[PDB]
């Protein structure tokens, strides 16, 4: 997630806290949105390999 | 057979020729793109200094700075540089009106006329253009309401070609004032044009009195008011010696000491002879001990060491003093009288104004800019204004330019030209028509519709309006009586008569021979 | 209608303004609050740190002539306002990108020229409409606009200790009432290798880097300072001299008598009852003698050699003191006298003489500069003479503005909107104008890590009601009110910026060429 | 190349058979690369990572 | 645009100087503590000077990269103010930046960590 | 610690230019490109002279040419050529500005990243800005599908193409030349035409203006006999592939005589043999005959005795292109030839063409021909290959008109309301893909800047006043006054283009610079 | 930045049109000596071929056998070449007149005027020129009597450039009886030229 | 250069220097020759000068 958010141009800090705070209890599918520039359920956005 | 020593040349009457025309041509559109009221400028770079290197529109100095190896073009670039000492600007004109004397004339020789006929030809043209030039011109002798509003004229014309355009107005304010103060005296060096960065180009000035650039001594008053001045060559810290050389031999120190004390006095006494005019304002070129300067606190007299041979001459124009030595005869010297002396700081210096002065004679432009490019150029261009300005004061006389005078040479030119007939009459039309290119050339860098412009400003001269020229701001014919586009006979009668000269002896040239350098 | 034949002119235009841009982006780095230093090794072989633009320039060996006014124009603008040296750069780089925008724009460049000169007219009204009158006495604003300047150099590390350093320094050396632009020379500075940045300390006094050269005096009180120009040595003539030895009792008396002329020499000097000794250099001849030391540390006087003419002014200045040059003129009346003076020990064993607390005050100061690298101590050094500089800016004009760019997207929405109004060819010009003010805000956030985009563009969208105290802010990361957090320049640092680049661009448009010279 | 031919690349497999590698450790990751790209794709980014 | 030389700008002159301050440290990494083991230097010419105070090899050690020199000159300052911690103060300085630039080597930005640092 | 190390070979010489430093020179190369590019688009436009390797030299205005022909060493520089390559053989002329579309486009691009942009946004509104654009193109579609059997559409759009190439001396005659042979050659019940079926051939000589369209065949040999006449009124013609000798079957074979009788029979058979070929020729019925071999010469001769002019060592492609013109066949043998597969054409007669050097000949065919061919003449070498390229492409774009069959009016009115339309819907854009959309349009806004900066005229007053006209009427029928007439009505002025030429070319360059956009890092090793 | 490979140059619409005239005006100049009845003659010579050397008054074969580097140049060869496989000589007047025409249209680049609108009055021109030549055409069929007089005095005509100026008539009877033998027949190859030393000029014959 | 119809030569210096003259004197003497009669040309000229 770092790499991508920094070839995203993002505050990968504020993205990775927020990703392990939401990530400890909320769901498991939570992780990088591009275009939200945020976290995400990616799953239900079918980003899926 | 080979005759000269090797790395020896011989170009007889096509090479010859060639190689000088094109290397005129080139000088010529080398330059070209300098001219006009819109006209532009160069960068010139050294080789290695580091990078030394000037942004320039004043052509002599482009010539002055170029290497050039073919000799015509290092011909035409000294003509450049006389013409720089004569008027200033023009060179631009100079150079620009003999290049293409020279391209047509090679035109010439492709109709292939005997190169003699052509010299006496363009004699000819030459001498009945500057006479028509002369029936042209306007004077303005005592009428000074006109004068000094042609002499505004002048300088608002010279100076729209340089960078300091957008800013015509105030640089005429200046350079008006400036050679007014002169009295008439053609002396330019009694304008000192000091230049320092900082500040817009618009916050460039004259003072209204005289400006040094030298540290004052120990705590001498640092202000100074109804300042008495007085100004010698005696050189102080240098002690006044017997130039021979004479020992000192003695028998005990006792003698030395007393001999280092006698030194003091004599010293202290000179002090003394200087103070005995009264005078609170001292100043010399040479360096002074710091001894004397303690001397003159305990007067609490304030006084300026190390002011070159410039400033002694303009601080003897603007104060009037008579720069002097030994002070014996205080009677017989006339000192120097100011308003007032004081402390200024510029951008980053403090410096030595001098406001209320007894003469006018002398004065100096503050110059502050952007660049030292920018400030190197606008003191070259306020040079050739003050240089043009005063040629302008000692022959009160002025020319309609914009090209206009130019197109009366070649109207007249051509009109002679019937009554020439001959061969010299192919040359007549000849000199007209590169006569007639500059305006052209003008017209455009002004980027208008040059070949319009110029038949439409032929057929109005031919029909005998003298005075219609051309307008630089939006590219037509008009009265240049009423726009004031003028400038000095002796300018334009120096371009042509030196232009005439030039393409004499290039074209009498039909052979380049080049030792081997060494 | 009318045909461009040429095309090197537009060539020519194209290379520099490239060659700018790649400059500006280059310096584009080191900017703002979150400004980042560079670092340069010399050719020579020395390395120096910088985030100041104009020394970053000055340490630039840059080939294309058109970058080497720039640096130029970075010159100006330091000797002018101190930073924003930077911006003027970033804002000459912006230019003259949108200036090839509208070179491929088929627009003449005179035109653009004069547009431009509209342009800042309407910048300058803007400006000087925007800004807060201050007077000068109050400090807590001269603190904000110092702490300001600083925390955009590494010296931000104690930007809270060196901004009341500065704006303390200043306000002792200036006179509060005339408001004149009262020189920075008067302050001295000091690098000091050694101990820390914290360290960093003013001295309202005197301070000499030399050393002592009397064996056994460390520390004075009640002092009395006396600085004397004349050698204490055997007397050597200003002309050639010596001694004949050809007789019996010369000998002694030579030797006796030489010692007597040094006696009388610190009797004297003793009876006027100073107890501290000043010398200058005197490299022409002899310096102070070694048998004269010996009687001053006999009579127990602090002595100093080689102090060099150039600090006489600043230390008589400073010390309230008048040299002395002969023997006589040496008398209690001028003895200055100082609470104290001694030779404190820092740098394990680099010694460093202070004089603190005068009876006559002068007005001069001086500041000594402590940290580890040298490297370091030099950018501080740097950035504090640029702290004394803005203050003295802010001396020149009693007007403030808030900082973070604020004023420049001020004057972004002001010019679109006055060229929306504006017709012509010029309004295109203008737009490009206000585009090119567009860049600083940009950089800002991205020095800042923020989307620079969408930040400038609610900025403007803010800023359309949300006038000038609202603006970028660092520590929030977002956009508010600035002046509330207390980030402010004076005026006179972007209106020089402005005016200065102006002119440059000005100029570069009247370029076409550039020719190779000897 | 040193042929002149030109090469574009997005998958980091075939950049690392084009970075011909001398060093000895690196090239058992550019074998990596090589291994995932004949198993699974991309990602051989990834597991260089 | 500089004859005579190119230049680096971010990641690759960050990594520059954390490599050239790991060299220096690993230079006097082995001379420190109550078990350190001295060194040695064959000058050129063989007049040789076996020394374990990391100021004193500095100083005997030439240098080139600026960063280097930075770090050399702190040494012979710590040196002419304490005496010992040379056998210290360079690896302090070292690993510190080595940290400071791999949180660095992130993202985030420097002048935060230089803040971070003095409140340290 | 520190020490240097081996990573890559030849480590010193590997060189490397990363991330914006490496996109801005990029963008650099490129706008490089766009400006040598500039000058040829255009009729006003001015073309580029080439310098082969080999010092020879060729003047031509076919962007793919100059990019093709050009040496260039910087990558991305290759990029551009290879685009203009792949656009023409795709289209035809339109590469007399792609690679500028391609410029302009990326100058503008690198105006974003100024701004700190990130690329792939730029990439990605792109994208969504080419789409937007060739939509409301082919809504703003004219249509040639409902016109008539289609003269002078096509010739008006020859007309066109022909505009930018030096050919524009006689280029009427030129276009229709072209729409002829295309319509002639053209499969309607397919959509396509081969131009293999085409014969492109210029003879240097005469006039400009003597080009003509052949409806046959012309072979680059003479007569194989001189003796034969040189005219014929008849046209019975055949076609062999054997050559006119006794055959050999080309497994390795040779006879082994023995005897006297042995020698003799063969002696007899060598001239039987020949005497039985001319039997069979002649009782075919055919009247001249063509041989893609060479002959023996005293079967030349014999073939003389019987009235029977043939032509000796013609190429294959030349030889079918005789059958299908002649409507004949391919014949291996004597022996299976007859009347039926005998070729027929109207005239064919030999040309001595050249003042004083070897001749022609020519087929005036006179039935329908699926296959034709033009001639072309002129004073230059030079001339003649501009011609050959330019007619080509006159050929490709028609027949991409026979691919679809609608257009648009050229003059760049096009692209001009492709832009307001981009601008329209930046509005309801929103975030930052805005910028981008607004940046296509100004980018794509480049080509009627240059259109008028090659006309000299001013060009962005003239460009202002287009926008307004377009803007308060609803036409999107005018361009630029290219050839300074009053009416900026390119519907009547009938300059027009192919919906799928501009429709291509956008399409192509976005993808192009998308792609340029997309890279950031570079490793060149040193030469 | 460089663009090419080393070894490749770049000259745009000022140095471009500088070389491409000089070295046409070059080429004019070069054979303006051959033309006229009164004309010259050039002399040719092969770098290495024992001395390979042609005493030449035909401009095609001088342009032929010079080697020039100026592309514009070249093409003013080729040129020349075609025109001479048309009619043989005026290759002398046709790169002539090219080279004036070129010197001139500088001259006229001097006044700056776009050089599209030059193409497309010279064009215009050239058509007018065309038509009032067709117009000041001269036939001559079946008037046996001046149709031989006026191909003499083509002979005449044309035969006055080369060194067989001094014996017009003979060639011209000559050239006359052998064309005429032709019997209309186009194919010069039916001429045998047989060429060996010795005898006079005037020796020579049919 | 002989007669008011003739035409003058100019020279170049060994130091680069430039002289445009008629008089064969001069014409001879800032002549660089090495042939021996050519130097008794150029020492005839000045004499005779």
Redesign the interface.
């Known amino acids: 997630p770092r790499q991508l958010c920094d070839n995203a141009?993002f505050?990968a800090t504020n993205i990775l806290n927020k990703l392990r705070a939401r990530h400890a209890q909320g769901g498991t599918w939570y992780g990088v949105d591009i275009n939200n520039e945020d976290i995400a359920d990616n799953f239900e956005a079918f980003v899926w390999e | 057979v080979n005759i000269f020593k090797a790395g020896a040349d011989e170009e007889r009457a096509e090479t010859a020729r060639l190689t000088s025309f094109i290397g005129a041509i080139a000088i010529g559109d080398?330059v070209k793109?300098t001219l006009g009221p819109?006209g532009?400028?160069?960068?010139?770079?050294?080789?290695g200094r580091?990078?030394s290197?000037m942004?320039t529109?004043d052509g002599a100095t482009?010539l002055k700075?170029?290497?050039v190896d073919n000799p015509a073009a290092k011909v035409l670039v000294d003509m450049s540089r006389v013409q720089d000492d004569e008027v200033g600007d023009g060179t631009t004109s100079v150079t620009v009106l003999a290049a293409e004397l020279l391209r047509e004339a090679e035109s010439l020789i492709a109709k292939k006329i005997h190169p003699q006929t052509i010299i006496a030809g363009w004699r000819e043209a030459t001498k009945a253009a500057r006479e028509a030039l002369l029936s042209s011109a306007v004077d303005h002798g005592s009428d000074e309401v006109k004068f000094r509003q042609d002499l505004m004229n002048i300088a608002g014309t010279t100076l729209s070609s340089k960078?300091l355009t957008?800013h015509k107005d105030h640089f005429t304010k200046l350079a008006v004032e400036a050679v007014l103060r002169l009295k008439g005296s053609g002396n330019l060096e009694a304008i000192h044009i000091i230049k320092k960065?900082?500040?817009?180009?618009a916050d460039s000035y004259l003072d209204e009195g005289f400006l040094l650039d030298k540290?004052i001594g120990?705590?001498q008053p640092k202000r100074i008011e109804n300042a008495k001045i007085l100004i010698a060559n005696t050189g102080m810290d240098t002690?006044k010696?017997?130039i021979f050389?004479?020992?000192?031999?003695?028998?005990?120190?006792?003698k030395?000491?007393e001999?280092?004390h006698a030194?003091?006095e004599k010293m202290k006494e000179k002090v003394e002879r200087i103070l005995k005019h009264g005078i609170n304002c001292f100043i010399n070129r040479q360096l002074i001990?710091?001894?004397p300067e303690?001397l003159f606190?305990?007067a609490g007299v304030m006084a300026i060491e190390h002011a070159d041979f410039a400033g002694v001459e303009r601080l003897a124009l603007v104060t009037g003093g008579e720069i002097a030595s030994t002070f014996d005869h205080p009677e017989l010297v006339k000192l120097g009288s100011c308003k007032l002396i004081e402390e200024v700081?510029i951008?980053?210096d403090?410096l030595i104004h001098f406001s209320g002065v007894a003469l006018g004679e002398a004065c100096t432009i503050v110059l502050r800019?952007?660049?030292?490019?920018?400030l190197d150029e606008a003191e070259r261009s306020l040079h050739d204004a003050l240089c043009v300005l005063a040629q302008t004061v000692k022959d009160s006389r002025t020319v309609y330019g914009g090209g206009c005078s130019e197109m009366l040479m070649a109207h007249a030119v051509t009109q002679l030209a019937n009554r020439t007939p001959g061969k010299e009459a192919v040359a007549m039309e000849s000199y007209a028509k590169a006569l007639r290119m500059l305006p052209t050339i003008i017209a455009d860098n002004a980027?208008?519709?040059s070949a319009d412009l110029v038949a439409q400003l032929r057929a109005a001269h031919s029909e005998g309006n003298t005075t219609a020229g051309l307008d630089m701001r939006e590219g037509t014919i008009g009265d240049m009586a009423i726009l004031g586009i003028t400038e000095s006979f002796q300018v334009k009668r120096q371009v042509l008569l030196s232009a005439a000269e030039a393409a004499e002896v290039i074209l009498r040239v039909d052979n380049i021979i080049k030792a081997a350098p060494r | 209608?009318?045909?461009?034949?040429?095309?090197?002119?537009a060539?020519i235009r194209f290379s520099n303004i490239?060659?700018a841009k790649?400059?500006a982006?280059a310096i584009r780095?080191s900017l703002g609050?979150?400004g980042?230093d560079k670092?340069i090794?010399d050719?020579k072989g020395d390395?120096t740190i910088t985030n100041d633009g104009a020394t970053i320039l000055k340490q630039?060996?840059?080939?294309?002539?058109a970058?080497?006014?720039l640096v130029?124009?970075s010159?100006?603008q330091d000797?002018?306002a101190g930073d924003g040296t930077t911006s003027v750069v970033i804002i000459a780089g912006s230019l003259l990108?949108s200036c090839t925008?509208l070179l491929?724009?088929?627009?003449?460049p005179?035109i653009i020229?004069?547009s431009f000169?509209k342009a800042l007219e309407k910048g300058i009204e803007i400006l000087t409409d925007m800004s807060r009158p201050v007077e000068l006495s109050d400090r807590e604003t001269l603190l904000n606009s110092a702490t300001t300047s600083l925390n955009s150099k590494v010296v931000?590390?104690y930007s809270s200790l060196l901004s009341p350093m500065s704006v303390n320094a200043v306000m002792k050396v200036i006179d509060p009432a005339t408001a004149?632009?009262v020189?920075?020379r008067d302050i001295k500075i000091v690098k000091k290798?050694?101990g820390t940045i914290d360290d960093c300390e003013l001295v309202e006094g005197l301070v000499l880097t030399q050393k002592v050269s009397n064996s056994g005096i460390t520390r004075v009180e009640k002092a009395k300072i006396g600085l004397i120009?004349?050698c204490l040595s055997?007397?050597?003539?200003?002309?050639?001299?010596?001694?004949?030895v050809?007789?019996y009792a010369?000998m002694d008396?030579?030797l006796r008598?030489?010692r007597a002329?040094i006696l009388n020499l610190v009797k004297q000097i003793k009876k006027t009852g100073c107890n501290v000794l000043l010398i200058q250099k005197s490299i022409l001849r002899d310096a102070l003698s070694d048998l004269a030391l010996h009687f001053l540390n006999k009579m127990k006087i602090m002595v100093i050699k080689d102090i060099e003419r150039e600090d006489?002014?600043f230390i008589?200045?400073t010390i309230g003191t008048?040299?002395?040059?002969?023997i006589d003129?040496f008398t209690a009346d001028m003895l200055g006298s100082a609470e104290l003076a001694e030779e404190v020990n820092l740098?394990?064993?680099g010694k460093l003489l202070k004089i603190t607390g005068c009876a006559s005050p002068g007005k001069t100061v001086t500041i000594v500069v402590r940290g580890?690298?040298?490297?370091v101590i030099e950018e501080a050094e740097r950035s504090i003479h640029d702290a004394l500089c803005v203050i003295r800016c802010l001396v020149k004009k009693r007007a403030l503005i808030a900082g973070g760019g604020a004023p420049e997207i001020e004057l972004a929405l002001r010019l679109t909107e006055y060229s929306r109004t504006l017709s012509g060819?010029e309004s295109?010009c203008v737009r490009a104008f206000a585009d090119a003010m567009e860049?600083i805000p940009?950089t800002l956030?991205?020095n800042?890590?923020l989307?620079?985009?969408?930040t400038?563009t609610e900025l403007r969208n803010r800023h359309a009601q949300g006038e000038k105290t609202a603006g970028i802010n660092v520590r929030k990361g977002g956009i508010s009110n600035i002046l509330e957090e207390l980030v402010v320049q004076p005026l006179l640092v972007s209106v020089?910026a402005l005016?200065?680049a102006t002119?440059?661009v000005?100029?570069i448009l009247?370029?076409?060429?550039?020719?190779?010279?000897? | 190349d040193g042929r002149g031919k030109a090469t574009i690349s997005n998958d980091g497999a075939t950049i690392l058979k084009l970075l011909d590698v001398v060093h000895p450790a690196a090239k058992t990751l550019v074998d990596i690369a090589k291994s995932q790209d004949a198993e699974v794709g991309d990602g051989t980014t990834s597991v260089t990572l | 645009?500089?004859?005579?030389?190119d230049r680096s700008?971010g990641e690759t002159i960050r990594s520059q100087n954390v490599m050239a301050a790991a060299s220096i440290a690993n230079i006097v990494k082995s001379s420190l503590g109550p078990v350190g083991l001295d060194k040695m230097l064959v000058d050129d010419i063989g007049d040789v000077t076996i020394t374990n105070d990391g100021a004193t090899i500095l100083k005997l050690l030439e240098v080139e990269h600026?960063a280097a020199?930075?770090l050399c000159?702190?040494a012979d300052?710590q040196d002419?103010?304490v005496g010992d911690g040379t056998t210290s103060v360079v690896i302090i300085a070292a690993e510190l930046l080595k940290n400071a630039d791999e949180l660095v080597k992130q993202?985030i930005?420097?002048?935060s960590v230089?803040s971070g640092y003095?409140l340290a | 610690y520190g020490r240097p190390f081996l990573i890559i070979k030849d480590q010193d010489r590997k060189s490397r230019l990363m991330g914006l430093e490496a996109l801005?020179s990029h963008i650099?190369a490129a706008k490089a490109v766009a400006n040598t590019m500039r000058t040829s688009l255009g009729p006003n436009g001015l073309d580029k002279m080439m310098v082969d390797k080999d010092g020879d030299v060729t003047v031509t205005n076919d962007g793919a040419t100059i990019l093709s022909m050009m040496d260039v060493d910087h990558q991305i520089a290759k990029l551009m050529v290879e685009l203009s390559k792949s656009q023409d053989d795709e289209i035809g002329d339109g590469t007399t500005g792609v690679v500028v579309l391609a410029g302009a486009l990326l100058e503008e691009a690198e105006?974003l990243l100024?701004?700190?942009?990130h690329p792939i946004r730029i990439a990605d509104g792109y994208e969504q800005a080419a789409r937007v654009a060739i939509e409301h193109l082919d809504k703003i579609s004219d249509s040639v599908l409902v016109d008539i059997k289609d003269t002078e559409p096509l010739i008006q759009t020859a007309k066109t193409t022909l505009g930018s190439k030096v050919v524009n001396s006689c280029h009427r005659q030129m276009a229709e030349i072209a729409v002829n042979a295309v319509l002639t050659v053209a499969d309607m019940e397919r959509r396509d035409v081969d131009f293999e079926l085409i014969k492109v051939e210029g003879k240097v000589g005469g006039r400009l203006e003597d080009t003509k369209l052949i409806k046959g065949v012309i072979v680059d040999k003479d007569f194989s006999h001189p003796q034969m006449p040189k005219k014929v009124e008849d046209a019975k013609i055949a076609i062999l592939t054997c050559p006119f000798e006794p055959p050999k079957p080309k497994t390795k074979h040779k006879l082994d005589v023995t005897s006297v009788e042995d020698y003799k029979a063969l002696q007899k058979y060598e001239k039987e043999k020949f005497e039985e070929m001319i039997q069979q020729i002649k009782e075919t019925g055919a009247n001249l005959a063509i041989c893609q071999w060479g002959f023996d010469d005293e079967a030349n001769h014999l073939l003389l005795q019987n009235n029977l002019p043939a032509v000796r060592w013609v190429g294959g492609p030349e030889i079918e292109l005789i059958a299908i013109a002649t409507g004949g066949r391919i014949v291996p043998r004597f022996s299976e030839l007859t009347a039926e597969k005998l070729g027929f054409a109207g005239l064919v007669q030999e040309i001595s063409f050249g003042t004083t050097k070897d001749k022609m000949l020519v087929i005036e065919q006179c039935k329908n021909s699926r296959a034709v061919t033009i001639f072309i003449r002129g004073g230059n070498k030079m001339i003649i290959e501009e011609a050959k390229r330019s007619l080509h492409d006159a050929l490709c774009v028609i027949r991409n008109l026979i691919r679809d069959n609608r257009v648009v009016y050229g003059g760049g009115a096009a692209e001009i309301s492709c832009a307001l339309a981009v601008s329209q819907e930046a509005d309801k854009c929103p975030?930052?893909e805005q910028?981008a959309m607004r940046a296509f349009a100004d980018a794509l806004e480049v080509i009627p800047?240059a259109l008028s900066?090659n006309s000299?005229?001013?060009?962005?007053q003239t460009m202002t006043e287009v926008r307004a006209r377009q803007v308060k009427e609803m036409n999107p029928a005018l361009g630029i006054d290219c050839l300074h007439k009053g009416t900026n009505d390119m519907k009547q002025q009938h300059v027009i283009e192919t919906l799928i030429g501009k429709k291509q070319q956008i399409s192509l360059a976005t993808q192009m610079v998308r792609m340029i956009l997309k890279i950031d890092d570079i490793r060149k090793p040193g030469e």
């Not at chain 2, 960065?197 to 180009?201: C, H, Q, R």
């Not at chain 3, 630039?60 to 002539?65: I, R, Y």
């Not at chain 3, 009247?510 to 000897?518: C, E, L, S, Y």
């Open positions: 141009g505050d | 080398l793109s819109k532009m400028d160069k960068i010139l770079l050294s080789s580091d990078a290197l942004v529109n482009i700075n170029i290497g960078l957008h960065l900082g500040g817009s180009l540290k120990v705590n002690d010696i017997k050389g004479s020992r000192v031999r003695v028998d005990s120190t006792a030395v000491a001999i280092e030194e003091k001990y710091n001894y303690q606190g305990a700081m951008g980053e403090k800019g952007a660049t030292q490019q920018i980027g208008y519709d | 209608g009318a045909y461009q034949d040429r095309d090197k002119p060539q490239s060659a790649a400059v982006d780095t609050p979150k980042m670092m090794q050719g390395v630039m060996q840059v080939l294309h002539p970058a080497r006014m130029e124009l010159k100006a000797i002018e990108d925008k491929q724009k088929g627009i003449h005179t020229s004069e000169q931000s590390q004149t632009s020189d920075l290798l050694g120009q004349f055997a007397p050597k003539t200003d002309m050639d001299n010596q001694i004949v050809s007789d010369q008396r030579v008598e030489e002329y006489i002014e008589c200045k008048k040299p002395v040059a002969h003129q740098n394990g064993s580890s690298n040298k490297l060819m295109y860049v940009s956030a991205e800042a890590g989307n620079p985009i969408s400038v020089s005016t200065l002119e440059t000005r100029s009247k370029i076409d060429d550039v020719v190779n010279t000897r | 645009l500089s004859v005579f030389g700008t600026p020199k930075v000159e702190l300052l002419k103010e993202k930005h420097p002048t230089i003095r | 801005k650099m105006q100024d701004r700190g942009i975030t930052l910028y800047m900066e000299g005229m001013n060009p962005i």
